[PDB]
Design a protein around this nucleic acid. Sequence first.
RNA 1: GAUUCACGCAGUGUUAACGUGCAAAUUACUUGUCAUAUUUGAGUAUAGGGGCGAAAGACUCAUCGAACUAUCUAGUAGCUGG
RNA 2: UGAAACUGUCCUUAGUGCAGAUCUUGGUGGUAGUAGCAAAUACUAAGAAGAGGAAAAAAACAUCUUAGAACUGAAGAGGAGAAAGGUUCCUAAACAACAUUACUUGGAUUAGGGUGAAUCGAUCCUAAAUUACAGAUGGAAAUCCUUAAGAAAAGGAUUGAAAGGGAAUAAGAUUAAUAGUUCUUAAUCAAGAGAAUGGUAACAUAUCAUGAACUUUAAAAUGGAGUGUGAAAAUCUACGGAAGAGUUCUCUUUUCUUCUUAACAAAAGUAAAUUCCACUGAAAUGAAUCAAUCAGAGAAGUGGAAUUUAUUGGCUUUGUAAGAAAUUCAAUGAAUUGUGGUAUUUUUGCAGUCUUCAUAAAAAUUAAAGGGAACUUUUGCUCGUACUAAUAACCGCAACAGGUCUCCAAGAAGCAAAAUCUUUAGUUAAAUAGAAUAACGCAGGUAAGGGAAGUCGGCAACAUAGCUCUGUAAGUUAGCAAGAAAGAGUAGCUCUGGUGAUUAUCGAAUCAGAACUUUAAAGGUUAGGGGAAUCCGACUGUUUAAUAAAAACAUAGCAUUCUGAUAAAUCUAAAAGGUUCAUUACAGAAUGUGAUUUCUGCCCAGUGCUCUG
RNA 3: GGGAACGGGCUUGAUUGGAACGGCGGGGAAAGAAGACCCUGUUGAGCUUGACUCUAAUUUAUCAUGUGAAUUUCACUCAUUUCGUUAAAUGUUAAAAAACAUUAAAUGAAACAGGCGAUUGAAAGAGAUAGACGGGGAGUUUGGCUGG
RNA 4: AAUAAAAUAUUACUUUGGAUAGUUUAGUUUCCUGGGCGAUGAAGAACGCAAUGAAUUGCGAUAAGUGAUAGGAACAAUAAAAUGUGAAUAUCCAAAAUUUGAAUGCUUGAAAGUAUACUAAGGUAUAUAUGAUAUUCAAUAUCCA
Lengths: 50, 246, 72, 102, 60
Amino acid sequence: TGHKGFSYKLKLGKKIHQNRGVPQWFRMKTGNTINYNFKRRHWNRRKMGM
Amino acid sequence: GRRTLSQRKGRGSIFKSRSHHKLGVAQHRAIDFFERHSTVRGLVKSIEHDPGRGAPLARVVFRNPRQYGLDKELFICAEGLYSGQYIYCGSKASLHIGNVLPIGQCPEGTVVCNVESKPGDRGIIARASGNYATVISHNADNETTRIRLPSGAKKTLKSNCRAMVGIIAGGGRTEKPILKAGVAYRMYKAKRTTWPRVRGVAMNPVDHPHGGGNHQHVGHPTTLKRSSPPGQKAGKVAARRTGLIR
Amino acid sequence: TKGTSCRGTRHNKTHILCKRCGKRSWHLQKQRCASCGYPDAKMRQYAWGYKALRRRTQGTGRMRHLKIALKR
Amino acid sequence: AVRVTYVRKHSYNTKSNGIRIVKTAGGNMTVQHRQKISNGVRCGDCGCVLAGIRHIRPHQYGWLGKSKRTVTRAYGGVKCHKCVQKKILRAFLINEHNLIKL
Amino acid sequence: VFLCEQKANKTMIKKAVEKRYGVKVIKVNTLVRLDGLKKAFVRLAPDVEAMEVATKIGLF
RNA sequence: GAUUCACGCAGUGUUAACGUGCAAAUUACUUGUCAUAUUUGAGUAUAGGGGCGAAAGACUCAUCGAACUAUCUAGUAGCUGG
RNA sequence: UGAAACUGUCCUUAGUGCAGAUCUUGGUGGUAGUAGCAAAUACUAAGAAGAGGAAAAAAACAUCUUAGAACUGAAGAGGAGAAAGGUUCCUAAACAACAUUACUUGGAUUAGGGUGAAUCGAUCCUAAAUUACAGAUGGAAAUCCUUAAGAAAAGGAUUGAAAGGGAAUAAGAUUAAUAGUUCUUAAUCAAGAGAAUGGUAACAUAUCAUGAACUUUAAAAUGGAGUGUGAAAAUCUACGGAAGAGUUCUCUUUUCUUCUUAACAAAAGUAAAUUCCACUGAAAUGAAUCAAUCAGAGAAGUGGAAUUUAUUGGCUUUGUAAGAAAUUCAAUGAAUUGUGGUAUUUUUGCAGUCUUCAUAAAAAUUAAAGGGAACUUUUGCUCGUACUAAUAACCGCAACAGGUCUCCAAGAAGCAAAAUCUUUAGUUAAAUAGAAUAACGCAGGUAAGGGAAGUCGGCAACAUAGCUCUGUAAGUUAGCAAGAAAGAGUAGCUCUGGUGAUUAUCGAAUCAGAACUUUAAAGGUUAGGGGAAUCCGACUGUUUAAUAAAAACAUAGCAUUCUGAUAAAUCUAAAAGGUUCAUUACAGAAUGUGAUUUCUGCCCAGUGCUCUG
RNA sequence: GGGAACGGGCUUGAUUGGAACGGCGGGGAAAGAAGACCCUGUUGAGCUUGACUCUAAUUUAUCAUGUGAAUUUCACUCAUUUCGUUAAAUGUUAAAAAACAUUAAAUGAAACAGGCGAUUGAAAGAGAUAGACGGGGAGUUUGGCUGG
RNA sequence: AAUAAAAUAUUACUUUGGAUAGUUUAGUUUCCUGGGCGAUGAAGAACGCAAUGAAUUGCGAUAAGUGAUAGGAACAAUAAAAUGUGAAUAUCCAAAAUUUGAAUGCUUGAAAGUAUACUAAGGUAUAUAUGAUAUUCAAUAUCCA
């Protein structure tokens, strides 16, 4: 919203920081099965409800 | 079963009084020496209209006799009171209109409104619009006086009770026929929530004990004992006589 | 109009995030949290919700100063 | 014919959110927040407005010059000249009446 | 334009720029970015040139 | 708390359209209504043998002649299927 | 085929043998290349980029520029906000997936960038309300009281509004996006720092001109309806122009665009309304408004005073300020920016009138009075600020024809913010198109002669419709019925007259009348069918969200019962506990019938209620 | 035709070319739902009532020991009820006038009480036992045979 | 009377799908030892920190880690740096330990804040009930001059 409290803006800021994919170098490790982020979301698919 | 509308009216959820624009508590002033053994002088600053009652409230402004400053009050307006008036409220006050007197000084047959029920509670009896209580007699043996309440019942009160002389203003209010539904709906602007009243016999059996069957009727006598349980106490409670009076 | 038509005026939030449990369970009008029993001092635990105990109880977090004492 | 928009976040035409549209350089039309209308002072006995004191906001009286918020007279600023002419005669005729009564 | 810590304000930032770079500051504008970092728009005095301060920091 | 037009709102009739739809109740024309018992926003109050109801057993998060969720609970069944 | 475990006999043990439980879970068919991809008027030509219009018409082709043609039509398909969403915002690269074809496009993939406040809000105050210590109640959980019970808080505690109250900011410019937030210029507020005169009177003096305790007054602070009017803006228009653009073989001194100015302050000139003051004292009564209303507790007249009128002082004018901006010319430099209106609408104030058995908030905070105790400079902290605000950013499982609170508002035409068309602005894409023009369909129509014979029933459809004049029954609560019913007129062009201001000029749409002509005229759009009877409900009103909208519910009226307030009703397990009650019989509580008029008959045995027996 | 008495399949016949496009409603006792009408449950639920058995509310009697006295009737306050204030002169001695009134001049402004000021009062209310009332409320039941 | 386009039947190879066979850093039950949190601030929640991290693990402004004691030559996806003058690793140790939370100075909604005293920013103490001690008071409640 236009008017968000301080403790509410910093929680939104973490939810856009966590909405990022796997770094390229991480997937190239040995025995690394973490190829995709399954905790991801989007603004039009799933409302995070917060 | 259910809880009828008389059972939900006791909790006070939406049935609380709409007393938000009300001026305040209309009553005499606190008892003291200057009123018990002398007289004070009050100025009727202005007549006001306390919402939710048909008797105007007058804003009397006394002087603090023990300290420095004004002692503003709020008196129910007896009929005939005007702005700029001087009303004296004491035991030795003169028997005029609006002058508060102890009930034990008024001659028999004097008209007193807003009479106390016990010396010091500041007004109980005869407060509505256009109503008054008339003194009957006196009894110096036990300092008690008889008066006739506006209901016709006669009550015995101590002679120290204060009672403003006269009848209450705004009389003859109900003689006007409310013509519409809207006028009756606006009358409850500053009262509780009870106007549109749905009949018991136009109700299903759960809501009211009068909920009828295939014909709209009661089915059992409406005259009930006083000792009925709350919820079934409907109709006429402890009726000595019913029907039109001939 | 008890279905799709009446679902258009839902924009006045009722439950906001709580402070002691972190779930969206703080009832604004009742002023108490429905999941962790806020201002009430005791954490709200009921025996019929045996699953609601193992979702948040001792051991489910970091155990910052308790994993030390038990080791000693 | 230029259509303007509220410049503050207030979007409702409340009493505190009155605006006036004025012209501006180049034919642009802008929005200004105009203040509310207030009542003047009133005599303490008759309830009539007093002359010589402007009808402005309660705090704006502080910025006025010390002679721009009173009237130079006994009970000047709290009672009308009729409200005071009667005070003097009451305070004098009464004193003469009870001077000889007792 | 810097990236200060959130818990500062327009007073302990005005001194921190003046003390760390030996300059004069006449205006600080701050905002809290989403990440939590506070971006401060420190405006130096007219006599001091920000270009020579910027090269000293290493921006250019 | 007069008669009507309009912005809006409703839902009288076609028992029209659609009826694996735009829609888990909507669309078109026709009709009524369109400021005082008027329409509406936000905050606050009232919670399950309870609330609220200009009264239809109606409304109480697509659930009401007794809401949703969990524990007793793998309830009991002389009855149907395997 | 496969690549590291396994088999036979005896005994023991079992979570041991499947075709069914509408069985549970997982996968896959026929239906089937079928039904579909049809509301929202609409696209075409040239060019660019691109693998992505080739071709025996493979008749269709996504994004961007221009031209043509159009729609929403200013209560918008325009410009912005609150709630909700949370990165959707902007740019670059890129197209495996997703937007019922495709996409070079995207609210989609990846990576960067973006949200600037002493003046806007939060913060501060209180509203309906909410919650603490002590106290009371309670087996218990916990409940009640919120200033009453208190050695607590001068008089009473906490929370409660981004729509209520509130100290102070504007114009121009800038960015790929932020700007009452940045830059230039120009201001404002708060907190500091460095015992006076004038006027008869109303009252007045670029801070001035002392003013403590205590007290009071006032502002903050308040319903609605209708009329009249001042002012500004928009639209329209008159006189005189400056610059540019459009039409021109047929004419038009023609049609269009621009000609502007803030916050804050000053006083050349000059208004409307209201309330007061001084002189005199009204009758032959006057003064005045659209309406009213006012006067010997004092009218009219003359002279004054104060206040309101979007910041100072309302309008013009001035500083700000032309140096800005708009429109042009030349290739950074040059030109201009008068004066009116007895026109319509909107906005904001003022004046009285009307209506209530409705009288239509509180505090923070500020000023004055009664009383007499003793020009400069510094700082202004924290939090929000991007974006949509919807036929694609919210809620509906989604780019759902549903739902969702607001501000700004051009022309034609009309009584109308109606229907229909256009200007500034937005868009041509919004679940795919081409061909053929069968049936049966959905939506929209028309018709010979008859006109409800169709059918449960005039269902559906057709027909009357605006305005002016004439006329208008029975019944009736005397108000209504009534737009009753019924009849006449209406176009175009050229004329005439009536309705005003100033001393002949000037301005307004409005009414009436007369010639002449025609295709004989409200009808493109908007736009009552009428009558005679019967039943119910008195009327306006409300209801089964999603099959019942009424003859039901309500309602004003009539009537009945209890109650003197420590009461009646009545919530709680309990309570110095709670509701009507900030109350007091013209009141509180419990009921039946349902306007007005007329009338409510006989019955107290039975069952209830009551009794002074 | 018989059949579970209205077959696509069985028996006897009529008759039969492979694939399937547009239509249209006769058949598939077509699809949608463990019939909602009826009956059987020793299965429920709402509602009603002198159905059975209880219960909150209301009411009546007894117990719970204030003093002075002459089971009952009086007087007092001391528990107790209902109140009111800024706990602000209790008890006893010596209506002409919508105005102001305060921080005292020189003890002024009297003392004492075992009661802040009143009302009710040994009655009332709360508890225990007992009788009455009580669909306001809880729990439950409402046989069988039977040409349905 | 005829064709095998459709249809049907068997086998082989391929596809959609993951049954069967082999394995298991995971579980279930039983028994043994303990049953060791908290105003010195617990359990839980939130935010933040890697050279390149989104999760997760580890940790708390000394941050995927510091000091000490044991330990003996690594880490690795890639580039860097450090390293027998001691890299990895381990621990009932020392230092440190953000905002909250019984939450405790007042307030706390998604709230931004804020008062007094001690030592401009920084750190401390100040909630309720409670025992003991010390100090300051109130009541004529009992005596008494």
